[PDB]
Amino acid sequence: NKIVTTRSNLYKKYNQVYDRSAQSFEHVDHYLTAESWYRPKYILKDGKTWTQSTEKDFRPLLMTWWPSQETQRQYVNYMNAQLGINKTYDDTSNQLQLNIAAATIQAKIEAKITTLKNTDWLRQTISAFVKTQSAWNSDSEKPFDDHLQNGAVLYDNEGKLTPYANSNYRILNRTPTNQTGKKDPRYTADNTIGGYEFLLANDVDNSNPVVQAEQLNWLHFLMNFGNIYANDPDANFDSIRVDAVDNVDADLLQIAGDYLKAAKGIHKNDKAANDHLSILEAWSDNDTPYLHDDGDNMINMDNKLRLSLLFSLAKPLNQRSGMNPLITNSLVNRTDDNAETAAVPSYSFIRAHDSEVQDLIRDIIKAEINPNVVGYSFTMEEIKKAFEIYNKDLLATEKKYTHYNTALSYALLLTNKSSVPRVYYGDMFTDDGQYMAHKTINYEAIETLLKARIKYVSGGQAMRNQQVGNSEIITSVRYGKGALKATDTGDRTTRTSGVAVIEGNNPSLRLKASDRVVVNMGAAHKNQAYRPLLLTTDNGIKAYHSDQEAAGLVRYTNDRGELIFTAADIKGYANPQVSGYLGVWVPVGAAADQDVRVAASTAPSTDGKSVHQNAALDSRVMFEGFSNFQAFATKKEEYTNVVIAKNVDKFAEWGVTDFEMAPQYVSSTDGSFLDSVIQNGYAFTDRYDLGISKPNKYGTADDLVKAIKALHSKGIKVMADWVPDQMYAFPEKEVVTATRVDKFGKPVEGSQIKSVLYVADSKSSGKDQQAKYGGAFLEELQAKYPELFARKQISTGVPMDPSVKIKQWSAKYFNGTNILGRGAGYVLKDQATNTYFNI
Ligand SMILES: NC(=O)c1ccccc1NC(=O)c1cc2cc([N+](=O)[O-])ccc2s1
Ligand SMILES: [Ca+2]
């Protein structure tokens, strides 16, 4: 427990600690660290004159004390090299010699403190020395593992030396697959446990009922952000994206779903459901059947269709698969999709802010810049270096790193039945640079598809796979509004709606002279003029924005309703936009204002599901409205949210019904991960700081409020990114009992970190937005919706615990943290007793 200095400093009556007070030491939970400073009784002012300590005369403990005589020697050699004392001390040095060396070092340290009138240089120098000792750096945290940040440490549930960090929970890996602690026997598509607990930074223990209640509190805050912050009911987020589903306790999915039902009534009818359409980012193939059984309170991605698009269209030519998966490899087999309501709702995409963007930057970095890059922990310089290669590759016909056939992918996504398409910002605008400043070469094609989707895309779907010539094509037909089956004759609006997409994925595609591609348009489209919407050209894609813009290319269906194409129409191409073939055709003569979308019904839902993949849901479009690699704004007019408010008419014109905004939390700046480098909003210290204490990357809190209001002014719903997995860069240190683990929480054998003291950054200020809003709504929520707090959650068997409000985050609310490079012995012991110092 408890004086420190004795037979290692021959100055001890002057250098010993001022008093036996805690305020004399820079401690962490009354423990001492290698970097701790303290107030001695006297300071050898200017290295000359012993003076009494001036209450603000703190000095490094390593100036006067050392854990071992080996460490004293290392310190002496290091500080000699730092202070211009050309004299090292070798393995045989005696204690007397080291003490006199340390006294000389102290004298010249105090001389330099007076000379520079600052002690910063000495903070830096002592830190740098400390990081040379294997017990105080990564060497004792090794071996590294496939954790994204090389390793993690799990806080012990019962630590006698740190009882304030104890917990009865920290139940790990309770993914949807593994929510009960055993693999769910219902779901067999993913043989694994369907995720893992430790992803990034400080891992929130979402098995803690108090933390669960605080996650509900935060969810309520986001869904009432307008009301709460700006006292404006038109500035609320309408929906959520559930982040990192496979790395958090799946109880949150019930908590969120219950809330959406209790507070917004999404289970009552489709109008309520589609007004708060919320999504998961859940990567396991079990998560979609799990979510369907849970009640379709949210929708997951169609990962199968995403993979089908990626490998059939986007991959390099020699790595490209056959085309038939595009029809059959997706939640919905689109061979003949004639259902009024699909079995399972989903959203579909080809790229996201992370998926197939930062992966490509990593590919580029590992291939031409830094082959040792760890996960996605890029440096800004690596990113800007990789972006020149990336941007040059985007424009090439032969691409080594970037996607082929973007427009073909979007032609399928934006005409497919039975899924909500999600358009990625970085496929219409550049992934880097200022928001909406520079269009991609595919902007025109994608915009044309969005507007044509509003005007033409409705009805049943038919997909066909035809072997022609040396290769293959696929056709995708939508029959038109009101025609679910090919035999439906339709009315006047059916006649002028529907669409045909013809695609190939092989630039060598050549049809035989005798080859015919017979595309059945449906019984509403006999003897009808059709005109192109999109056509592949030698250099790219020609888009047609009107019936007159295509006057000369009209063709006709026969009396059986079939368009027929020959080698004269279809062949392979190879240009920056197409590797294969794209043709999109629409019927001639749709009124300029034709709109085949349908609004959600208010009729009562009766199947026990909240979200239904019907024509009303199919009429929606999701827009992921940000890029990880957006440039930082240079002026207020370039702020993301300001631009969004100014350009909301464009999103209305594209049919965007759901704007998925970037997470709006003020980013941390530690740079320990991609998110902490480009500051997208996923690395944060304050869950409630939505540009309040300082602008986020996208503007001020007021800019956010105005962007939400502008989006609502067009009937567009807005989605908040709910990120309960982790938090970064806490400002206050804490001492925990910790064990080195893999990303599943399994202890690493032979690690010196095994039920030992470790210094984390895991306490928030207590003076931030969390301190203001934390738990502030739990009384309102329990009053309105008592059944939310009556539910016995699956992973824990007990309800949420709102009896405690989290005003300051602390290690007891976290599973653990990524390894911090502080070592296994950062907390100082008395060498004789082998006991940790506690003041
Ligand atoms: N870094 C993240 O955004 C993240 C977030 C939550 C959970 C895991 C994450 N990791 C991934 O992005 C992965 C993609 C895939 C894709 C598949 N699959 O297609 O089957 C399987 C495993 C992974 S992990
Ligand atoms: Ca986690």
Author numbering: 208 to 209, 211 to 1047
What does the paper say about this structure?
Streptococcus mutans employs a key virulence factor, three glucosyltransferase (GtfBCD) enzymes to establish cariogenic biofilms. While GtfB synthesizes pre-dominantly insoluble glucans, GtfD only produces water-soluble glucans, and GtfC can synthesize both soluble and insoluble glucans. All Gtfs are composed of three functional regions: the N-terminal variable junction region, the C-terminal glucan-binding region, and the highly conserved catalytic region in the middle, which is essential for the glucan synthesis. Previous studies have demonstrated that glucans produced by GtfB and GtfC are essential for the assembly of the S. mutans biofilms, while glucans produced by GtfD serve not only as a primer for GtfB, but also as a source of nutrient for S. mutans and other bacteria.
Seven potent biofilm inhibitors emerged from this study, the lead compound #G43 was further characterized and shown to have anti-biofilm activity through the binding to GtfBC and the inhibition of the activity of GtfBC. Compound #G43 consistently inhibited the activity of both GtfB and GtfC, ImageJ analysis of the intensities suggest 80% inhibition of both enzymes, while compound #G16 had a smaller effect on the activity of GtfB (60% inhibition) and GtfC (70% inhibition). To determine if the inhibition is attributed by the binding of the lead compound to the enzymes, the OctetRed96 system was used to characterize protein-small molecule binding kinetics. The his-tagged catalytic domains of GtfB and GtC were immobilized separately onto an anti-penta-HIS (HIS1K) biosensor which consists of high affinity, high specificity penta-his antibody pre-immobilized on a fiber optic biosensor. This sensor was then exposed to varying concentrations of #G43. Assay data fit to a 1:1 binding model with a fixed maximum response, which produced a KD value of 3.7 µM for GtfB. The KD value for GtfC was more potent at 46.9 nM. As the catalytic domain of GtfB and GtfC shares 96% similarity at amino acid sequence level, the selectivity by the compound is remarkable. Binding studies of this analog against GtfB yielded a KD value of 68 µM, compared to a KD value of 3.7 µM by the active analog. An analog that does not contain this functional group lost the ability to inhibit the activity of Gtfs and in vitro biofilm formation, demonstrating that these effects are directly related and that the inclusion of the primary ortho amide group is crucial to maintaining potent anti-biofilm activity.
